[PDB]
Design a binder for this molecule. Structure first.
Ligand SMILES: c1ccc(CNc2ncnc3[nH]ccc23)nc1
Length: 167
């Protein structure tokens, strides 16, 4: 039993809710919140900008030190950093950004990072400003992640479409 509430169950291991991931993170304090990161960990907008704003920019400060030491992530890759006031840990995962021309096949590699964590609160990777079709992202999630994932979808309209079209 865990503390996630109001989720619709899609499969054995995937759950989905219309929620603001920031507000859900602050209420649940999950072990892991996933950030929709870019390779530079520049948290300017979308989910990343919102999560970073909620940390009062502490996420960005920590991220800049990470990049200065380690260099950029790979598209499809991830790193574990602090969850600050939102979670124990933040798993920064880089989905392909269609608006940069990145290969959508890398979306499966991105979701594979979730399998290193038993339970996660997450957004749909490569959705929103990353330009992928969220229905495709949900399909890849279900077909790739084997650990327990709680997906927060900010937009109520998209949430209803994802549920109604789910196979
Ligand atoms: C429109 C469609 C999809 C998204 C995906 N981005 C997010 N997904 C979950 N929670 C969020 N909070 C802020 C952003 C965010 N954004 C905007």
């Amino acid at each position: 039993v865990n503390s996630f509430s109001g989720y619709l169950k899609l499969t054995d291991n995937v759950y989905i809710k219309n929620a603001d991931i920031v507000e859900e993170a602050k209420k649940v304090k999950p072990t892991v919140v996933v950030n929709a990161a870019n390779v530079y960990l520049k948290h300017g907008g979308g989910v990343a900008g919102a999560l970073n704003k909620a940390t009062n920019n502490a996420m960005q400060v920590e991220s800049d030190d990470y990049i200065a030491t380690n260099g950029p992530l790979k598209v499809g890759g991830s790193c574990v950093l602090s969850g600050h006031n939102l979670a124990k840990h933040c798993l920064h995962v880089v989905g392909p950004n269609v608006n940069k021309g990145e290969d959508i096949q890398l979306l499966k590699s991105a979701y594979e990072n979730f399998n290193q964590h038993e339970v996660l609160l997450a957004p749909l990777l490569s959705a929103g400003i990353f330009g992928a079709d969220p229905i495709h992202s949900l399909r890849v999630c279900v077909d790739t992640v084997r650990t327990n994932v709680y997906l927060a979808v900010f937009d109520k309209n998209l949430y209803d479409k994802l549920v109604s079209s789910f196979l």
